Design a protein around this ligand. Structure first.
Ligand SMILES: Cc1cc2nc3c(=O)[nH]c(=O)nc-3n(C[C@H](O)[C@H](O)[C@H](O)COP(=O)(O)OP(=O)(O)OC[C@H]3O[C@@H](n4cnc5c(N)ncnc54)[C@H](O)[C@@H]3O)c2cc1C
Ligand SMILES: NC(=O)c1ccc[n+]([C@@H]2O[C@H](COP(=O)([O-])OP(=O)(O)OC[C@H]3O[C@@H](n4cnc5c(N)ncnc54)[C@H](OP(=O)(O)O)[C@@H]3O)[C@@H](O)[C@H]2O)c1
Length: 257
């Protein structure tokens, strides 16, 4: 049912892997949206979970960036998937992490923790982000250095490619941090935005409600705290119906692994 086939798999850590699958021929989506994917349980019943599509809308395959939860009904199984095996994929994209859900502006911030970088793996590879904005800032905070690797490699490939670098024109600013392991840049996104450390580190103007638009993707706790910081700079939450300066989505439901 709604089956698509795994074309590649990549393991990053013992809790993180990415994979790619074939795309339904009629699937249309906007970068930043999520769909339901799944596998069958031991009784032949679907185990369905929401996943951001980690590949941009132009990409001919669909990429996903996944947690591995030991004893997690879906990921305890999904972590073992192989090329040629299949997943269930519902081709019904939705979500508020989309450029259309924000007022037009000059700078676009992506604020993510852990697998919350997933919708921004798509958006950082979306032409629209660079056509409609002069600067795209990717803040990704994880506990450890290895958890940043998937995103670091994505950003490196983008910036180092001769053509893409030309088209992007220095617009992408990447600000990875750790909160536990030693790394040259540390700290929570909330703390580093509120204190202005990120402005100094990247050599950019402070957050400005006139020109800045942001998207937030992490745990509920992260989202709540980030919203407060954004609002302290004068940015207001909206979405599609009445777009304002920022949008938020949960990277997962619960407390997190
Ligand atoms: C809008 C939406 C988009 C999502 N996008 C992604 C995504 O792109 N990639 C992804 O891996 N998951 C994503 N999730 C979570 C995903 O739906 C599942 O929870 C995940 O596949 C784990 O499923 P499970 O059955 O193995 O464990 P579950 O029973 O769902 O969860 C077990 C525990 O692990 C924690 N957990 C679940 N997912 C994560 C996560 N990704 N990071 C840290 N802790 C987690 C939860 O707090 C829960 O305690 C998303 C969830 C939503 C609501
Ligand atoms: O705790 P955890 O194990 O649940 O972290 P986690 O979400 O499992 O780990 C992801 C990262 O987000 C951070 N985080 C957790 N709560 C946050 C909040 N309210 N605001 C901003 N960042 C937050 C963590 O920084 P910390 O290492 O400081 O928790 C951690 O680096």
């Amino acid at each position: 049912p709604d089956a698509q086939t795994v074309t590649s798999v990549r393991h990053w850590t013992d809790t993180l892997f990415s994979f790619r699958v074939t795309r339904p021929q009629t699937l249309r989506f906007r970068s930043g949206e999520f769909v339901m994917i799944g596998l069958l349980d031991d009784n032949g019943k679907p185990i369905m979970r929401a996943y951001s599509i980690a590949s941009p809308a132009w990409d001919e395959e669909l990429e996903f960036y996944s947690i591995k939860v030991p004893d997690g009904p879906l990921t305890s199984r999904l972590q073992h998937i192989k090329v040629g095996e299949q997943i269930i994929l519902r081709p019904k994209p939705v979500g508020t992490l989309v450029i259309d859900a924000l007022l037009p502006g000059k700078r676009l911030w992506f604020l993510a923790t852990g697998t919350g970088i997933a919708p921004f793996a798509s958006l950082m590879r979306e032409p629209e982000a660079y056509e409609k904005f002069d600067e795209v800032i990717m803040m990704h905070a994880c506990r450890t250095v290895a958890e940043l690797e998937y995103g670091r490699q994505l950003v490196e490939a983008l910036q180092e490619d001769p053509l893409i670098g030309e088209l992007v024109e220095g617009k992408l600013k990447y600000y990875p941090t750790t909160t536990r392991e030693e790394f040259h840049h540390m700290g929570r996104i909330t703390d580093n935005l509120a204190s202005g450390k990120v402005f100094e580190d990247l050599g950019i103007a402070p957050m400005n409600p006139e020109t800045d638009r942001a998207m937030v993707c992490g745990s509920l706790a992260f989202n709540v705290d980030v919203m407060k910081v954004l609002e302290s700079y004068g940015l207001r939450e909206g979405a599609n119906s009445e777009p304002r300066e920022f949008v938020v989505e949960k990277a997962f439901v619960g407390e997190g692994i």
